[PDB]
Amino acid sequence: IVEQCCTSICSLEQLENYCN
Amino acid sequence: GIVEQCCTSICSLEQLENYCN
Amino acid sequence: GIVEQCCTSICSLEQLENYCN
Amino acid sequence: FVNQHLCGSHLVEALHLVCGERGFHYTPK
Amino acid sequence: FVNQHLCGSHLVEALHLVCGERGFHYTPK
Amino acid sequence: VNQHLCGSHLVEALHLVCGERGFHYTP
């Protein structure tokens, strides 16, 4: 989500949950 | 439109949300 | 909508073009 | 028909490419 | 946060991700 | 880095994390 990862640093594991 | 706002200039989250359906 | 047509099923170029403005 | 399923960013970018200067509308339904 | 520079597919995908279930409309202008 | 490119960088990161699977808006 743009709000969270640009109001904080997002991990790899958190980004993988958005993958198809 | 959103390109002028976000590519030519820089834009806020609120400006992007204006193009949600 | 376009997700049902193109993600759940397989769609055609013509179906994608139906969602152009 | 297209060769594959198109989901998420793959579908958004397909519409982006195909529609070009006309632009498009995307509702995830 | 600060205002963002977004062009091309970055802008399209920003709209995809920001608007979520609502979807969005994009015209490159 | 350039905080004006955070959204851009996020989209780039999703492209590399998800590679050829593609991504969507909900986790």
How do you describe this structure in short?
Chain A is an all-alpha fold and 20 residues long. Helix content of chain A is 45%, strand content 0%.
Give the tags:
A: mainly alpha, 45% helix, flat, D: alpha+beta, 38% helix, globular, hormone
Could you characterize what this model shows?
- Chains B, C: It comes from Homo sapiens.
- The complex is a heterohexamer, with three copies of chain A and three copies of chain D.
- Chain A is mostly helical.
- Chain A has two helices and no strands.
- In chain A, 45% of the residues lie in helices and 0% in strands.
- With 29 residues, chain D is an alpha+beta fold.
- Chain D has one domain.
- Helices cover 38% and strands 10% of the residues of chain D.
- Classes of the chains: A mainly alpha (20), D alpha+beta (29).
- Strand 1 (24-26) of chain D pairs antiparallel with strand 1 of chain E.
State the end-to-end distance of chain A.
15 Å
Ends distance of chain D:
20 Å
Helix content of chain D: 25-40%
Major beta sheet of chain D, specifics?
none
Radius of gyration of chain A, taken over Cα atoms and rounded to an integer in Å = 8 Å
- Per DSSP E runs of 2 or more residues, the count of β-strands of chain A stands at 0
Our count of helices of chain A gives 2
Judging from the principal axes of the Cα atoms, what is the shape of chain D? globular
Number of helices of chain D: 1
Overall geometry of chain A: flat
* Structural class determined from secondary elements of chain A: mainly alpha
Radius of gyration of chain D: 9 Å
Protein name (chain A): Insulin A chain
Disulfide bonds (chain A): 5-10
PDB class: hormone
Keywords: Insulin, hormone
